[PDB]
Assembly symmetry: D2
Homo-oligomer: 116 residues x 4
Amino acid sequence: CPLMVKVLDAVRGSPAINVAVHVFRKAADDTWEPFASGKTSESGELHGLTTEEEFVEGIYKVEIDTKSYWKALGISPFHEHAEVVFTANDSGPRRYTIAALLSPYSYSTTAVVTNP
Amino acid sequence: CPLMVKVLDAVRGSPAINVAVHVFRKAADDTWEPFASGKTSESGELHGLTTEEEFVEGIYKVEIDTKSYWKALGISPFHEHAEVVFTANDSGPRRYTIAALLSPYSYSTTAVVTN
Amino acid sequence: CPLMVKVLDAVRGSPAINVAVHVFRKAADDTWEPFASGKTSESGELHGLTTEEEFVEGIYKVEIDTKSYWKALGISPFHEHAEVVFTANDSGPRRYTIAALLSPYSYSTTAVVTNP
Amino acid sequence: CPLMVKVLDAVRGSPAINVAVHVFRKAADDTWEPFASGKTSESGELHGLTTEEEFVEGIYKVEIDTKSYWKALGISPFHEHAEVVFTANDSGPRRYTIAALLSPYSYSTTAVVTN
Ligand SMILES: O=c1cc(-c2ccc(O)cc2)oc2cc(O)cc(O)c12
Ligand SMILES: O=c1cc(-c2ccc(O)cc2)oc2cc(O)cc(O)c12
């Protein structure tokens, strides 16, 4: 699959499990349209969001619901969510891994982009 | 200075200078409305965005134009920008520093909330 | 395997390939003794460093040769290496993933620690 | 101030205060020898470690006692410490800030090298 999301908890040193993830694609009229969504699994990974056919060129937004994650663990975090916005498939189809590393007052995001 | 933004460059090991920063506040119709903006100085810092009277509780977005920065350096970037979204709450501490550390395919952001 | 190392390049958005990794274990006399070593593969991962039998409790050091990596890419980086030092297996055997995310003047390291 | 260390806490969103920091210089027999040390202030900063005359080219280690910090907060940490090792070179810029951002199972360190 062309798009995968992986989330890690920097406080517990574990995958961040059951984290909600919403993906949007920028429409011709410049609005964000719902593209796909899901929950991270026991391994902190979210697979199967889309397909090579559906994941065309465009600007995508991946919004990770970090706030609900921390609140379920009893922590009141700083951020409302982590939001990753990028142009995809601009030089042909690629595989994208979006990784986020979460702490209550900080997060980091990296993309690993490989060929098919 | 209730809100300061600081940007660092992980490739060159330097302040990220002349980086455009826009700040928005969530309006009651769920739309982002522009609030403040500027460009980081030679020290990679952006001071004077707002004041204590203006910076009321609310949900705020800080959008950092990382793509233009990397473009000025001739390095292909992954992200369109870095967007930091948070609720400002009064009972907590009085000053917010939003720090971001930039790489072409990665960024990290941290809030340092004091006083 | 109980210990795995994963290295990512934050400039190219790719796994960091052929990165040298040296693992040491603190001896009774407080010196660092050579424990294991290897190179990251095409996926930026290094598997097979040790075994459940050999990976006993102790203080371990994982030294990642980031400087040779950047220099081979034409970059003169800040750090000599990235060095991760931790107590392992103190409450029984665990699986450790040591991940490092590399930029020329910055790096981050995280541990994902799971049960067998 | 040729060398400054700054430490931030990613769990609390605050300067990491009272954190012990030791600095070593590689000696010709490959051994680390103590050079300077201190504890971070209320702003999470450690100033005055060395001087321009003393801080000659060499290989240096900055060891940050992150484990004691997390222990004082009652949070189980993964690392024994954070160890930042670098070559100081004169032709480059004149001032080094070693910044570290701490979480219990993760840290990041960046060098900001200016003037
Ligand atoms: O030099 C600084 C570095 C950082 C920083 C920014 C991002 C990181 O991942 C780690 C540290 O934050 C800061 C926050 C401040 O309020 C002031 C700083 O100098 C810094
Ligand atoms: O792609 C990955 C990226 C990371 C990672 C490493 C460092 C960061 O600051 C953020 C994410 O950890 C990982 C850990 C794994 O076990 C597997 C991964 O693919 C990743």
